[PDB]
Design a protein around this ligand. Structure first.
Ligand SMILES: CC(=O)O[C@H]1C(=O)[C@@]2(C)[C@H]([C@H](OC(=O)c3ccccc3)[C@]3(O)C[C@H](OC(=O)[C@H](O)[C@@H](NC(=O)c4ccccc4)c4ccccc4)C(C)=C1C3(C)C)[C@]1(OC(C)=O)CO[C@@H]1C[C@@H]2O
Ligand SMILES: Nc1nc2c(ncn2[C@@H]2O[C@H](COP(=O)(O)OP(=O)(O)OP(=O)(O)O)[C@@H](O)[C@H]2O)c(=O)[nH]1
Ligand SMILES: Nc1nc2c(ncn2[C@@H]2O[C@H](COP(=O)(O)OP(=O)(O)O)[C@@H](O)[C@H]2O)c(=O)[nH]1
Ligand SMILES: Nc1ncnc2c1ncn2[C@@H]1O[C@H](COP(=O)(O)OP(=O)(O)O)[C@@H](O)[C@H]1O
Ligand SMILES: [Mg+2]
Lengths: 440, 357, 433
């Protein structure tokens, strides 16, 4: 079967997982308490899709997920919330303090004594799996528990499951908006884990999603619920190829084969085109060409970077709903003529295309309108280097005076390791600047 | 406020018997004042290059060209520093490095007394000069103390009582000092060696995954030197008072290296904190010495984190004002210890990092 | 569970602790007899942070009370919430310190410290996962200084890795109550600098100014000042007891706010404050709370932040609000007042949000600043100290208790060093050789 395991680390991961599992349960017709009346009414089909759920003899469906965090305060909301009966009781809470925005704490002084249990639960989930394809690790840069425990967990998973894919859906610090003082240290220290052990790291920015919510959706005071719902929509669009039928399906291995030219540049941007309110859902055709053009607009990107300041090297478009390949080919032909959208000379093919028949689903109480057609773009571009460089500057401004360093070295961290991470990160920037140069 | 220049020295030891028997490889190269290290895991990427004041290739014992003999190391560091101490100004030498590296060789040297460390050679020169210059008017006095710092608590090694935590006070005129610390007079370098051996017997050590008796505490040997001149005058007074400190810094420690919880983790955290504070204070001192020496403009009073650790606090008089500093870092040459050596090199990068190349 | 042990010493500390326990019991809906009569299930979700459970479905606060004068205990027992506390935790002597730091530290407090530490050990052993301590005292110079610092040192020695928080009332230049405030304040600030992780500076002058100008009270009393300090204390640790969109543990605040070990003196603040006359004329939104929080007159430390620079800031909001507004307001505050913020930190405003506001408010906010202006407070004390130490104004009362003279000098030196630290980052440029 086609089966993927989701892992949520930290508060950001837990809340994004709440949104994601709300979306999946709405998609597959599973009630919050795990039952599905559809199978009893029909007596056929395969709506208990193995991509995310496991069936028991009583008709109850258990999600293939593991929630991890050192704070008990965010998981206990789930354990006493609406979905308390959906998940297995093994929610893996560490009954201690948080990593407290310290990478060292989350990594190797309190992240231990729970990593063994987490790996045991992951092994238990994988043993029930027959055709396990990859992992979907949700976390967030900048935080302590997220960065540190993700580093430890990905290292152990690469040791144990070195062949399987490992996708990341992480949140990157914004240029100006941030909710922590020591955030750049954790974000820079996360470079080793997001480089060596990750196979394809998707990054999003809070400022960009706030701008999208303000402009497109006309929500002037959005909260984290809207951000989590948008990220859930993108993840569902990525993963839909393994569940529903389609004219052209795209597996995870196909993503990894088409999007990354070289091993070290697996950091693509992601975006979602038909983000529009119900009021503005009218007055708009929302054809294939319009959404395909809306993908390339610099204002709709979910990371505060300018694609116009770089060169595209690999694009992948996943269409959902009433989409025919003729319109997609016409849209690609229209795109290739525009001069603002510059492609590297060494990738003349350009685009990967996938189409799926299942349209998007509207979450009740949400903000996205019902749309017959939708598309999700993944794009490998050099402009992401800009989104790194600014953060790099911030790190220097705090490392010149060794500010906040004593907290990290008080938990089994060598000071020089900071520099080591910085050095590695610098190489990444140069590597990106190496690939965008025109051939000779 | 005269400033204190700091000299950074690195030295490489030969292969031990176990490493010599095994097919180990050298990873360290030296050219003038530049030292480069090559990763064995991916040798094809690049060697990381660093710059220090002195780089010492003591790798091959019978080598004829560019061998940093112990007498050479003395002549660069200990001779000049002893001469500075003779003028009446404070002195402090530091030793850093991981276990299995040098340290003991650099400071003490071999027991056969054919090749000696900085400590016994410095003591011999001190006492020979004392016997040479002691006329009817001169009077030279030497005293020694030896203490340890462990979780920011001071303990005495010479005195065999119950090892309580001694109290640290601040004389308004004489600066920081330790209350109820044993101080003894000495008449030869043999007495110095005896007291140092007795103190080293009493230091705090513990068993970890890196060594069975890894050091768990810093230790300092203060040599107090006093000069009295009975000149042809009606008022004879102690002309000058100077101190010489020899510091044995315990090496850095990582969490994964020592998985034990409780005491060992707290010891490692305290050692790491003291080490970063010492790095900061030495780097600030190096920068402040460099600036005025060329500009000769005293910018207000600057600042320096004296009160961040007991080690930097008690060495406040020696570290800065008017003194000299120097640190020697020991390096293993075997690929097997590569990461460890790199960490040592990184700590040597502080103290007015040289850029060059 | 992240569980805290609360200690209080002296008249000021005990009264602030009584008001604080009243506020906390009201927040959790605890009957003064100890029973529970709350409205929601979240109140008992995290009751173990401050309370232990008895077999009769009663909740006993995890508080320990200390005073060498028994009278302060009696007024606490003969009060609205007197019966709530455990009788065994009323540790006290029968001889006052007499505003002598030496008596509270060396002569009298040294005998009661053993019993106090035994009670603290008993309380801590019952805690399944202790987080830190919370001491309420004052630097007037009686029990709160001497016994406070002695207990701080002893607890730090016993429990090195736990958090140590203290809410301390400083002396003031314009309002004074004892003649020997500077000596005791300096001697206590020495130990506070040595052995604490967070110290929230409180000034009677600032609280009186808040009462007169912001709350428009005509006859303020100590109850109102205790009420304000209690509101700040609850707001600091709100995130440990309730869920939120972005949590802030005590250790999170300690890590984000303290760049270097010695710079851990904080200026607290609270919003909203409307005086009950212009309440109906005020629109309550996140921008209004942000405007009131950063206002100079709202600070509780009696130090103008405009005379220095902010090393760090933390804002803990309570209530249902959108985080885009909060982040935009913090960014706007940083950009519009860029001169008053340190520049070698790219962003120095920690943010936290909680979904459970106070009982009778739609939304509120707690402020914790860390700025160079606090040095002014220390400088004032130092000046007064010199004015008494050059002539030995009242030293014979201290030296009679076995205190050496040199210790005073040591404390002064340490105090001066701290000022120099806070002076290092104050200048808004470094170019000139
Ligand atoms: C607008 C409204 O609903 O009425 C308010 C009110 O009018 C004002 C004037 C209240 C009022 O407060 C005061 O008059 C006051 C005077 C001196 C010192 C402190 C308070 C109020 O008394 C205070 C009281 O506050 C609370 O109930 C909070 O929960 C508060 N105190 C207590 O819960 C409490 C419990 C037991 C005994 C005494 C107080 C609190 C705040 C933070 C954390 C925990 C608790 C309320 C609702 C009001 C009145 C009644 C007028 C204010 O109170 C605070 C500090 O929140 C002062 O300005 C604020 C906000 C309001 O504008
Ligand atoms: N988009 C989005 N970002 C979030 C959300 N929750 C948290 N974040 C971001 O995640 C960062 C910190 O993540 P966490 O590691 O989970 O923080 P934590 O749960 O307190 O754990 P520690 O960082 O170790 O203290 C914050 O700076 C936020 O910007 C969310 O629900 N949506
Ligand atoms: N805020 C506040 N301060 C107080 C209160 N009672 C006393 N103080 C302050 O405490 C100082 C006197 O010290 P005190 O606490 O009596 O000494 P001790 O009790 O013997 O340790 C004075 O400067 C007062 O300003 C109170 O109820 N509230
Ligand atoms: N010329 C040299 N320079 C530095 N080290 C040397 C030299 N010759 C030999 N050594 C080695 O240095 C080692 C230092 O001993 P050791 O007790 O391991 O030091 P540490 O106290 O660092 O553990 C000895 O084992 C010795 O073999
Ligand atoms: Mg957390």
């Amino acid at each position: 079967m086609r089966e993927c395991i989701s892992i949520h680390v930290g508060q950001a991961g837990v809340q994004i997982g709440n949104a994601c599992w709300e979306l999946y349960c709405l998609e597959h017709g599973i009630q919050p308490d795990g039952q599905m009346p559809s199978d009893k009414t029909i007596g056929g089909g395969d709506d208990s899709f193995n991509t995310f759920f496991s069936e028991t003899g009583a008709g109850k469906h258990v999600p293939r997920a593991v929630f991890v965090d050192l704070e008990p305060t965010v998981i206990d909301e789930v354990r006493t919330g609406t979905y308390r009966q959906l998940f297995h009781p093994e929610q893996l809470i560490t009954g201690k303090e948080d990593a407290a925005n310290n990478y060292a704490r989350g990594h190797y002084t309190i992240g231990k004594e729970i990593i063994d249990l987490v790996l045991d639960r992951i092994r238990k989930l994988a043993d029930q799996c027959t055709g396990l394809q990859g992992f979907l690790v949700f976390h967030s840069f900048g935080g302590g528990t997220g960065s540190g425990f993700t580093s430890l967990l990905m290292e152990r998973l690469s040791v144990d499951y070195g062949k399987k894919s490992k996708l990341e859906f992480s949140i990157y610090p914004a240029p100006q908006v941030s909710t922590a003082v020591v955030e750049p240290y954790n974000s820079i220290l996360t470079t080793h884990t997001t480089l060596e052990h990750s196979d394809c790291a998707f990054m999003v920015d809070n400022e960009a999603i706030y701008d999208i919510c303000r402009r497109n959706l006309d929500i002037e005071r959005p909260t984290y619920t809207n951000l989590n719902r948008l990220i859930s929509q993108i993840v569902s669009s990525i993963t839909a190829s393994l569940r529903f039928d389609g004219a052209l399906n795209v597996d995870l291995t196909e993503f990894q084969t088409n999007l990354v030219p070289y091993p070290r540049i697996h950091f693509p941007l992601a975006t979602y085109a038909p983000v529009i309110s119900a009021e503005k859902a009218y007055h708009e055709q929302l054809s294939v060409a319009e959404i395909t053009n809306a993908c390339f607009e610099p204002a709709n990107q979910m990371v505060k970077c300018d694609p116009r300041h770089g060169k595209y090297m690999a694009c992948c478009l996943l269409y959902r709903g009433d989409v025919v390949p003729k319109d997609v080919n016409a849209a690609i032909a229209t795109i290739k003529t525009k001069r603002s959208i510059q492609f590297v000379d060494w990738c003349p093919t350009g685009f990967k295309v996938g189409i799926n028949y299942q349209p998007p689903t509207v979450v009740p109480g949400g903000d996205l309108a019902k749309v017959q057609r939708a598309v999700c773009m993944l794009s490998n571009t050099t402009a992401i280097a800009e989104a790194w460089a600014r953060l790099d500057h911030k790190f220097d401004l705090m490392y010149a005076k060794r500010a906040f360093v004593h907290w990290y070295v008080g938990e089994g961290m060598e000071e020089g390791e900071f520099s080591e991470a910085r050095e590695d990160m610098a190489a990444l920037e140069k590597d990106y600047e190496e690939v965008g140069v025109d051939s000779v | 406020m005269a400033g204190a220049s700091v000299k950074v020295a690195v030295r490489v030891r030969p292969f031990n018997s176990r490493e010599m028997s095994r097919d180990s490889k050298c990873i360290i190269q030296m050219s003038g004042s530049t030292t480069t290290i090559v990763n064995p895991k991916q040798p094809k990427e690049t060697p990381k290059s660093f710059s220090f004041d002195y780089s010492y290739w003591s790798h091959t014992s019978p080598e004829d060209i560019n061998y940093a003999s112990q007498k050479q190391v003395y002549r660069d560091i200990g001779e000049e520093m002893l001469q500075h101490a003779f003028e009446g100004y404070n002195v402090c030498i530091f030793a850093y490095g991981q276990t299995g590296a040098g340290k003991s060789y650099t400071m003490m040297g071999k027991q056969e007394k054919d090749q000696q460390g900085i400590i016994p050679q410095l003591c011999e020169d001190l006492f020979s000069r004392i016997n040479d210059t002691t006329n009817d008017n001169m009077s030279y006095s030497v005293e020694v103390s030896y203490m340890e710092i462990y979780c920011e608590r001071v303990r005495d090694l010479l005195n065999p009582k119950n090892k309580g935590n001694l109290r640290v006070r601040e004389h308004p005129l004489l600066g920081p000092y330790v209350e109820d610390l044993s101080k003894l007079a000495v008449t030869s370098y043999n007495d110095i060696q005896d007291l140092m051996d007795s103190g080293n017997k009493a230091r705090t050590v513990a068993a970890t995954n890196m060594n069975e008796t890894s050091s768990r505490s810093h230790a300092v040997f203060n040599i107090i030197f006093t000069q009295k001149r009975h000149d042809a005058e009606t008022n004879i007074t102690t002309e000058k008072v100077s101190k010489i400190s020899l510091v044995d810094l315990a090496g850095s420690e990582r969490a994964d290296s020592t998985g034990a919880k409780g005491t060992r983790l707290k010891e490692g955290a305290n050692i790491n904190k003291s080490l970063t504070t010492l790095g900061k204070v030495i780097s600030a001192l190096a920068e402040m010495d460099s600036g005025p020496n060329k500009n000769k403009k005293k910018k207000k009073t600057d600042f320096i984190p004296y009160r961040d650790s007991v080690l930097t606090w008690l060495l406040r008089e020696n570290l800065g004002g008017n003194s000299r500093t120097a640190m020697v870092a020991a390096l293993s040459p075997a690929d097997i210890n590569y990461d460890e050596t790199l960490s040592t090199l990184r700590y040597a990068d502080r103290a007015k990092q040289i850029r060059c190349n | 569970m992240r569980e805290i042990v609360h200690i209080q010493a002296g008249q000021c500390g005990n009264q602030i602790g009584a008001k604080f326990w009243e506020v906390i019991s009201d927040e959790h809906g605890i009957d003064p007899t100890g029973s529970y009569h709350g409205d929601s299930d979240l109140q008992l979700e995290r009751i173990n942070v401050y309370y232990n459970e008895a077999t009769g479905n009663k909740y006993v606060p995890r508080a320990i009370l200390v005073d060498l004068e028994p009278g302060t205990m009696d007024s606490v027992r003969s009060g609205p919430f007197g019966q709530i506390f455990r009788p065994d935790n009323f540790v006290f002597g029968q001889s006052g310190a007499g505003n002598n730091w030496a008596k509270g530290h060396y002569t009298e407090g040294a005998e009661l410290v053993d019993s106090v530490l035994d009670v603290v050990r008993k309380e801590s052993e019952s805690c399944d996962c202790l987080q830190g301590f919370q001491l309420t005292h004052s630097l007037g110079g009686g029990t709160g200084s001497g016994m406070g610092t002695l207990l701080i040192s002893k607890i730090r020695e016993e429990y090195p890795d736990r958090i140590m928080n203290t809410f301390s009332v400083m002396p003031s230049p314009k309002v004074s109550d004892t003649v020997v405030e500077p000596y005791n304040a300096t001697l206590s600030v020495h130990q506070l600098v040595e052995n604490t992780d967070e110290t929230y500076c409180i000034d009677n002058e600032a609280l009186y100014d808040i009462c007169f100008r912001t709350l428009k009270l005509t006859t303020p009393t100590y109850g109102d000042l205790n009420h304000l300090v209690s509101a700040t204390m609850s707001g600091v640790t709100t995130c440990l007891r309730f869920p939120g969109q972005l949590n802030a543990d005590l250790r999170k605040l300690a890590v984000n706010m303290v760049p270097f070990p010695r710079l851990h003196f904080f200026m607290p603040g609270f919003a909203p404050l409307t005086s009950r006359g212009s309440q109906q004329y005020r629109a309550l939104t996140v921008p209004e709370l942000t405007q009131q929080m950063f206002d100079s007159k709202n600070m509780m430390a009696a130090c103008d932040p405009r005379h220095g620079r902010y090393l760090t800031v933390a804002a803990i909001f309570r209530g249902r609000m959108s985080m885009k507004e909060v982040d935009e307001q913090m960014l706007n505050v940083q950009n519009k007042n860029s001169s008053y913020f340190v520049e070698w930190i790219p962003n120095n405003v920690k943010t936290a949000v909680c979904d459970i506001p106070p009982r009778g408010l739609k939304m509120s906010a707690t402020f914790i600043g860390n700025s160079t202006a606090i040095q002014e407070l220390f400088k004032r004390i130092s000046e007064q100290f010199t004015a008494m130490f050059r002539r030995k104004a009242f030293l014979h009362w201290y030296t009679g208790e076995g205190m050496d003279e040199m210790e005073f000098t040591e404390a002064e030196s340490n105090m001066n060093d701290l000022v120099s630290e806070y002076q290092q980052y104050q200048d808004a440029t470094a170019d000139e050789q």
